[PDB]
């Protein structure tokens, strides 16, 4: 892996930013690998999370947020267009009202902001992947 | 322009980071346009500058740094492989001992760190360009 995992990246996010994550699952899909992305409001892992994203490859995605230290109401989708054993490109685009999640160019979900995305100061990419690159673009 | 100019981007830089700047000069080369990139240590424009970069299109590049508010010894190169009127790609790659400057895939200079690049908290892109995109990658 080009970058260590858990990869904790300090970020500054604004409307129009894109977080592009490129990596490869480290286990085949029959082994139920996961990929987790957390939009943290501080480098401390107990800080609030504006957007939590856990892909269960070949299964579903679970999304949530943590406010005043409390996990809020979980959201899910079954649209998991990741391919077994291949590199993926995961793009999280910050619109004025939501994070748009695109997997390999395919939009799968729009997670609405309950706090402004400019409150995000760290993005952590974790779990069962090898990372080739992470870019924050505007 | 997709992004306003002067564009002041909060950043976090580490060894292995790449700053990729894509834009177009807003004047023809006979009009002596410039492109300036400042690696600032804080959002305040009077803060120290780890790496200052001013392209005089069709002419030369001037580089310097500002320490304790004082401009240090200026460095220059004549290698300015920008094309008149075209979009450029300016990549600044942070190695352990230097910033590598690549213009349109062409390495033109290596500006050695006199403070650690992790001290850079803001990158400002300014002067005679229209910006299509700025990405910070690892």
Author numbering:
A (entry chain A), B (entry chain A): 2 to 139
The authors write:
Because the primary and tertiary structures of Gal-13 are highly conserved among all galectins, it had been named galectin-13. However, our crystallographic and biochemical experiments (solid phase experiment, hemagglutination assay, and biolayer interferometry) proved that wild-type Gal-13 could not bind lactose or a rhamnogalacturonan Ι domain (RG-I-4) from Ginseng Pectin. Primary structure alignment showed that a highly conserved histidine residue was modified to arginine (Arg53) in the ligand binding site of wild-type Gal-13, which may be why Gal-13 could not bind lactose.
Aside from R53H, the double mutant R53HR55N also could co-crystallize with Tris, but not lactose. The Tris molecule in R53HR55N occupies a different position compared with Tris in R53H. It seems that Arg55 plays a role in stabilizing Tris in R53H. In contrast, Asn55 could not stabilize Tris, and its hydroxyl group points up in direction. Here, we found two Gal-13 variants (R53H and R53HR55N) that could co-crystallize with Tris, that also has three hydroxyl groups and shows a triangular shape when bound in the ligand binding site. However, the hydroxyl groups from Tris could not be merged with the oxygen atoms of lactose.
